[PDB]
């Protein structure tokens, strides 16, 4: 084949996110049986069906027995097969079981998109598959220059917003990509001049990124249990890099992770201290802010293309009885997100 004229960082990114064995490795982390439910047999209607059974388990948990829960728990394992042998699988009887399986199904939908792109489309042996798979993302990916002003700001945002409670690792920036999804700037147009626009982190495991870069950051479907998410079904961001970095699910077994920096139109923020499982904001509000105990220093804010970057060192917020150690931002319209950068990170585990 032609050998591909993309930059080397962009080629390694494409290899990373379209890695088939990594998708299988991700599925087994959720205790799924690849013998019964392999990567090829995965589909949206199976995942939505599973979401719905998880919504029924939510219902029984919220109204209190282990007799009826058994039936609802088993119907979930029917739709998404798990690897337990001749088993008796673990009972899904609490809020944690609902949250845990909801976050799995979240990941399965992103993996299904990644694999469907991979096994959809055309097969040209004369083209480099790195180029072929790059075009399927419908995203322009350019490498940011390490001496640029935007690179200095971004590295400082990584540097300053690593929390003391997440000091089992620290992060090196390997590559900084400027990204532009097809039609996203057009979709963002109603919110482009809205007040309180902020550059915020979104971390996910590397097997989600083909899905994210093709479909954008999305909302979990109607079938999904709204109790499974702390502030309901929206798109979640953080202003502390380490908080988002944790959702990469790096370890000593693959700490090369990916993380987004997106422009989020927060507007009038509906501020909250504790969990509120809502599927629609109160009138006049454009986002939720989960109030953190710690927050980046408001006086040390910096502008990048007219977008605030909260890159100050973590200080006390003056908020008392909150569930959250750090801030949290949620939007419930996908048009309020415009993804600007993607960072490839280097997790130095000190344990
Ligand atoms: C399931 C599939 C159709 C894609 C639908 N969503 C794309 C966005 C994905 N998930 C989220 O935005 C989300 C992500 C999390 C966890 N999370 C997270 O994964 N990364 C973060 O940076 C983060 C920051 C603050 C709080 C939570 C974070 C919790 C609830 C969510 F709804 C699922």
């Amino acid at each position: 084949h032609m050998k591909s004229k993309l930059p080397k960082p962009v080629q390694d990114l494409i290899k990373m996110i379209f890695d088939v064995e990594s998708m299988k490795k991700a599925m087994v982390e959720y205790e799924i049986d690849l013998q019964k439910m392999p990567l090829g047999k995965l589909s949206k209607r199976q995942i939505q069906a599973a979401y719905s059974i998880l919504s029924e388990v939510q219902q029984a948990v919220s109204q209190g027995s282990d007799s009826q829960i058994l039936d609802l728990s088993n119907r979930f394992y029917t739709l998404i097969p798990h690897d337990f042998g001749m088993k008796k699988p673990p009972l899904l009887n609490n809020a944690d079981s609902v949250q845990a399986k909801a976050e799995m199904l979240d990941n399965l939908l992103d993996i299904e998109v990644a694999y469907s792109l991979l096994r959809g489309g055309s097969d040209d042996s004369s083209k480099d598959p790195i180029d072929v798979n790059y075009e399927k993302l419908k995203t322009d990916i350019k490498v940011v220059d390490r001496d640029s002003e935007e690179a200095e700001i971004i590295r400082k945002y990584v540097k300053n917003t690593h929390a003391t409670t997440h000091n089992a690792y620290d992060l090196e920036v390997i590559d900084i990509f400027k990204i532009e999804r097809e039609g996203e700037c057009q979709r963002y147009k109603p919110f482009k001049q809205l007040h309180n626009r902020r550059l915020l982190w979104h971390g996910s495991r590397t097997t989600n990124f083909a899905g994210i870069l093709s479909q954008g950051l999305r909302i979990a479907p109607p079938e999904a249990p709204v109790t499974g998410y702390m502030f309901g079904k929206g798109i979640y961001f953080a202003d502390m890099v380490s908080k988002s970095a944790n959702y990469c699910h790096t370890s000593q077994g693959d700490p090369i992770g990916l993380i987004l920096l997106g422009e989020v139109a927060l507007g009038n923020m509906y501020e909250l201290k504790h969990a509120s499982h809502i599927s629609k904001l109160p009138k006049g509000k454009h986002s939720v802010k989960g109030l953190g105990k710690t927050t980046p220093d408001p006086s040390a804010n910096i502008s990048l293309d007219g977008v605030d970057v909260p890159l100050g060192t973590g200080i006390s917020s003056g908020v008392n009885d909150t569930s959250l150690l750090y801030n949290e931002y949620i939007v419930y319209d996908i048009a309020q997100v415009n993804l600007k950068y993607l960072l490839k990170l280097k997790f130095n585990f000190k344990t």
Side-chain angles (χ1 to χ4, degrees):
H1 43 67
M2 190 61 187
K3 198 53 59 172
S4 188
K5 289 158 182 171
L6 293 171
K8 240 296 165 192
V10 178
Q11 294 188 41
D12 289 325
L13 180 64
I14 293 292
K15 284 198 204 83
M16 226 195 330
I17 70 177
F18 283 105
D19 194 290
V20 175
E21 294 295 301
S22 301
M23 295 167 193
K24 293 183 193 170
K25 185 186 166 183
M27 285 177 70
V28 301
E29 280 176 55
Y30 315 126
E31 312 184 54
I32 293 162
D33 186 28
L34 300 169
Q35 184 67 26
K36 292 284 146 191
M37 187 65 138
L39 190 55
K41 272 65 153 214
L42 209 70
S43 71
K44 282 166 277 162
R45 80 172 65 75
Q46 294 294 84
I47 295 159
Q48 290 164 33
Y51 269 132
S52 304
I53 305 313
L54 209 56
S55 295
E56 206 168 9
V57 173
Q58 163 198 272
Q59 200 78 61
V61 169
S62 300
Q63 72 198 37
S65 59
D66 285 29
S67 300
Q68 204 204 337
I69 287 282
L70 179 60
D71 296 297
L72 301 178
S73 185
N74 289 319
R75 292 156 177 184
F76 183 78
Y77 293 120
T78 306
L79 297 170
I80 305 300
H82 284 59
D83 193 40
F84 296 118
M86 296 292 148
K87 56 187 201 171
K88 287 259 196 168
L91 191 63
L92 305 169
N93 63 350
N94 53 48
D96 289 350
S97 296
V98 172
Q99 290 162 219
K101 300 297 186 209
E103 196 169 45
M104 169 196 79
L105 295 171
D106 277 18
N107 289 298
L108 291 190
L109 277 176
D110 281 317
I111 293 170
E112 196 283 321
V113 173
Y115 195 79
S116 71
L117 287 174
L118 214 51
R119 303 315 185 198
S122 302
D123 186 66
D124 193 343
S125 309
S126 77
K127 289 182 179 177
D128 197 317
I130 298 292
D131 286 317
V132 171
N133 298 336
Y134 172 81
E135 298 303 326
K136 293 171 173 182
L137 299 170
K138 290 150 167 268
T139 301
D140 181 51
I141 312 175
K142 299 162 73 82
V143 176
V144 175
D145 200 332
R146 288 150 179 168
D147 295 318
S148 62
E149 188 178 18
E150 67 195 317
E152 289 168 272
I153 293 162
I154 289 161
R155 283 198 302 271
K156 192 175 184 183
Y157 196 14
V158 173
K159 184 183 180 283
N160 289 10
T161 71
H162 198 120
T164 305
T165 59
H166 308 138
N167 72 338
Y169 63 91
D170 56 51
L171 303 161
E172 329 171 28
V173 181
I174 305 307
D175 305 304
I176 300 172
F177 303 96
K178 178 88 188 74
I179 55 167
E180 195 177 338
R181 291 201 327 106
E182 192 177 80
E184 204 180 68
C185 276
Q186 195 65 55
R187 194 180 67 181
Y188 191 66
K189 206 166 286 194
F191 304 92
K192 87 196 172 183
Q193 295 174 333
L194 194 73
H195 77 288
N196 298 336
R197 280 172 301 104
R198 218 172 283 180
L199 195 68
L200 301 169
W201 299 105
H202 183 98
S204 203
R205 58 230 303 170
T206 65
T207 51
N208 289 23
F209 275 86
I212 294 155
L213 291 177
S214 89
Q215 306 306 298
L217 290 173
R218 294 174 284 171
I219 294 162
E223 291 94 340
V226 71
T227 277
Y229 313 95
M230 188 172 179
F231 301 108
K233 292 183 285 186
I235 304 173
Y236 285 61
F237 301 90
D239 59 24
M240 299 286 284
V241 70
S242 60
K243 180 154 180 185
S244 283
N246 296 335
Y247 294 97
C248 301
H249 288 289
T250 45
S251 68
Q252 289 85 342
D254 172 48
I256 307 300
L258 294 169
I259 192 164
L260 301 165
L261 276 172
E263 187 182 330
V264 189
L266 302 168
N268 189 9
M269 305 189 283
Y270 177 41
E271 300 184 352
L272 290 172
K273 294 178 160 181
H274 306 276
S276 181
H277 308 290
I278 67 180
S279 283
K280 38 213 162 200
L281 292 164
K283 194 169 192 171
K285 302 290 189 180
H286 306 89
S287 64
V288 165
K289 182 180 180 179
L291 296 170
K293 202 174 284 182
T294 301
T295 183
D297 193 358
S299 59
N301 276 215
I302 265 168
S303 183
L304 169 54
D305 305 318
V307 182
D308 288 320
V309 182
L311 59 72
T313 50
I315 59 171
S316 187
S317 68
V319 177
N320 293 315
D321 296 292
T322 179
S323 300
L324 297 169
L325 294 165
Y326 310 104
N327 290 340
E328 203 167 309
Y329 304 92
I330 310 92
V331 290
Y332 306 79
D333 188 342
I334 69 188
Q336 296 179 238
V337 187
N338 192 205
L339 302 184
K340 288 290 186 67
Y341 306 88
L342 177 65
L343 278 66
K344 169 162 143 181
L345 297 174
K346 195 69 172 294
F347 286 68
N348 289 238
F349 282 105
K350 314 197 214 82
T351 50

